[PDB]
Amino acid sequence: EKTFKQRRSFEQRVEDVRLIREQHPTKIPVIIERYKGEKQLPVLDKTKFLVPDHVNMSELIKIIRRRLQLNANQAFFLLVNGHSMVSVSTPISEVYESERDEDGFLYMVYASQETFG
């Protein structure tokens, strides 16, 4: 029930990224959490993801859909910073440039619907 930010101080998160970027300069560190209102999707067993920087959002989606092993008809969306729908053909490197957090991580929430209210 604690989020990644609630479990790891700023200082620790800065450090995770500073280091993982030194060691994997073409990989994007991503935090992927289940939406606090979500009812349909299973929980991932990890939170911190390292994604090659040339993968499109569409490809990350298809990967996480296989990590969650989903029926083809199950809806699945990634909402960058909990709220933004970025184009599925955006390379994850460009999403990282535009939407990274102050700690160096790129944050996303997954949910089974697209529009609330």
From Swiss-Prot:
Report the record's Gene Ontology biological process terms: autophagy; cellular response to starvation; establishment of localization in cell; mitophagy; mucus secretion; positive regulation of mucus secretion
Its domain of life reads Eukaryota
Gene3D superfamilies, A to Z = Phosphatidylinositol 3-kinase Catalytic Subunit, Chain A, domain 1
Recount the PTM note.
Answer: The precursor molecule is cleaved by ATG4 (ATG4A, ATG4B, ATG4C or ATG4D) to expose the glycine at the C-terminus and form the cytosolic form, LC3-I. The processed form is then activated by APG7L/ATG7, transferred to ATG3 and conjugated to phosphatidylethanolamine (PE) phospholipid to form the membrane-bound form, LC3-II. During non-canonical autophagy, the processed form is conjugated to phosphatidylserine (PS) phospholipid. ATG4 proteins also mediate the delipidation of PE-conjugated forms. Phosphorylation by PKA inhibits conjugation of phosphatidylethanolamine (PE). Interaction with MAPK15 reduces the inhibitory phosphorylation and increases autophagy activity.
InterPro entries the UniProt entry points to: Atg8-like, Ubiquitin-like_domsf
Q: Identify the Pfam families for this entry.
A: ATG8
Q: Does the keyword Ligase apply?
A: no
Question: Per the record, GO CC terms?
Answer: autolysosome; autophagosome; autophagosome membrane; axoneme; cytoplasmic vesicle; endomembrane system; membrane; microtubule
Keywords tagged on the record: Autophagy, Cytoplasm, Cytoplasmic vesicle, Cytoskeleton, Lipoprotein, Membrane, Microtubule, Mitochondrion, Phosphoprotein, Ubl conjugation, Ubl conjugation pathway
The record's subcellular location field reads: Cytoplasmic vesicle, Autophagosome membrane; Endomembrane system; Mitochondrion membrane; Cytoplasm, Cytoskeleton
Q: Sites of Phosphatidylserine amidated glycine lipid linkage?
A: G117
Q: Where is the lipid attached (Phosphatidylethanolamine amidated glycine)?
A: G117
Recorded topology in the membrane = Lipid-anchor
Signal peptide span per the entry?
none
Known role: Ubiquitin-like modifier involved in formation of autophagosomal vacuoles (autophagosomes). Plays a role in mitophagy which contributes to regulate mitochondrial quantity and quality by eliminating the mitochondria to a basal level to fulfill cellular energy requirements and preventing excess ROS production.
Q: Which family does it belong to?
A: Belongs to the ATG8 family.
Summary of subunit composition and partner proteins: 3 different light chains, LC1 (a cleavage product of MAP1B), LC2 (a cleavage product of MAP1A) and LC3 (produced by one of the MAP1LC3 genes), can associate with the MAP1A or MAP1B heavy chains. Interacts at microtubules with CABP1 (via EF-hands 1 and 2) but not with calmodulin. Interacts with FYCO1 (via C-terminus). Interacts with TP53INP1 and TP53INP2. Interacts with TBC1D25. Directly interacts with SQSTM1; this interaction leads to MAP1LC3B recruitment to inclusion bodies containing polyubiquitinated protein aggregates and to inclusion body degradation by autophagy.
- Name this polypeptide is given: Microtubule-associated protein 1 light chain 3 beta
Native source organism of the sequence: Mus musculus
The gene from which this protein is expressed is Map1lc3b
